Design a protein around this ligand. Sequence first.
Ligand SMILES: CC(=O)N[C@@H]1[C@@H](O)[C@H](O)[C@@H](CO)O[C@@H]1O
Length: 129
Amino acid sequence: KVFGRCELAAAMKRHGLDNYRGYSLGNWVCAAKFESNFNTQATNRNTDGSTDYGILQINSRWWCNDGRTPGSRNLCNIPCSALLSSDITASVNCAKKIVSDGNGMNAWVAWRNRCKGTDVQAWIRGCRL
Ligand SMILES: CC(=O)N[C@@H]1[C@@H](O)[C@H](O)[C@@H](CO)O[C@@H]1O
């Protein structure tokens, strides 16, 4: 799919993300524009060979099943391609957990620099929720 600004982000609050586990509502949609640019089908492999998947940019190395990453933990227990499709109804049970890791956003790279020290509510702003 291709999501709009106010249209790609109303479903997180549909998936337990409002102020979930220490992270506030303004702190989320920013990074989505920073990892696959509001696009779910944007997947990319890394120099490190762990293919990242989805708008989320998750590597096949630590989190999912692609078969080209051996010794991969695959803790999420879901085929990597189980996210990218138009319905992401389940894609978040893993991200909802990737934070309890005690690293939280430590996994995501874009935010820590592009959304860190930012005006996060400036992203959640103008939209009715
Ligand atoms: C630049 C890029 O996409 N790198 C990814 C990052 O998105 C992801 O959070 C990380 C998890 O360990 O795998 C890679 O570092």
